[PDB]
Subunit: 129 residues, 3 copies
């Protein structure tokens, strides 16, 4: 059976009809994450701070199920202006992953997000026990 990932003091705290993610055997599915502060639930200022924080939130949920950034098998980034934020996502991923290797990834533009945010991400990880 899946195990829903319980919220942690490093992690988002779900405030509605959802979970932060689930462990399912070897796989870990993180729900949509965005650049909110875990404590207040409010969005962080700054384009790059926002996106870095979206990644950190996602990675925390993952790490709370035993997956690391090196276990990512798919990232789906939805943003609000691909022309504008694709380079930011690039820059933030260079910060996190260094020179690689990088996970498979898809970046799409979309009209509206959780809360009017600029970016939301879906992460799926493979982390055998």
């Amino acid at each position: 059976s899946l195990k829903i990932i319980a919220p942690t003091d490093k992690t988002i705290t779900p405030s509605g009809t959802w979970s932060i993610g689930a462990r399912a055997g070897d796989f870990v599915f993180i729900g949509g994450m965005h650049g909110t502060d875990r404590v207040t639930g409010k969005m962080v200022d700054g384009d790059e701070a926002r996106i870095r924080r979206m990644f950190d939130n996602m990675l925390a949920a993952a790490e709370a199920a035993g997956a690391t950034k090196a276990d990512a098998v798919r990232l789906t980034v939805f943003v609000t202006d691909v022309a504008k934020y694709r380079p930011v996502v690039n820059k933030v991923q260079k910060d996190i992953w260094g020179d690689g290797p990088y996970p498979p990834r898809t970046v799409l533009q979309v009209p509206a997000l959780d809360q009017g945010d600029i970016a939301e991400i879906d992460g799926t990880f493979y982390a055998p026990a």
Copy 2:
């Protein structure tokens, strides 16, 4: 190997180049579902009911492969107006999952779906 989930009296019937979903080892991958009637292909009337049909469709298909709502590891819900429909989604989810627990999800706005619908869901499950 994977096994394509074959249509059912509880299930939607595929009308083109796709399947309802597939079982792959321990997992179940349901393709996109709209809030339509399994028997007519007409989009069921009215917001609340439509969004509930969507889930009920998705969940029948999951059921055809031996997956229950308690098995959802991902829901991706695309809607045509997020401000107007997440409340409806949130509400349909409470009806189905009660107080808890709930699957991971992501809810996005998309400018169009096939045949001018308001909502579409992608579900992934673990048995």
Copy 3:
């Protein structure tokens, strides 16, 4: 654990903060694919030719990892105009999959994709060794 799919003489060459795809246990995840020429990275001319190309790149990557079109457990197709392109996709899927059986899929309109392309695809595959 996870195995990044390395570029190939049949395959696209990553050039940015991503990989063509990954194999994890029994599954293969391919990142976003466009209808570009594997060698030049230029987008192919022609609606149908392009959507054919997009598909062909996705499967070339999936094969580099031991998966065939008969292994497809989910296709998510992001297009710029559902009305003008659902049919093109149906046609291309006929040409490739013949009478089937066809994979589970979803087709979405989306205001923009990177590079200004009209379509992009996400394939997930199941191919136990």
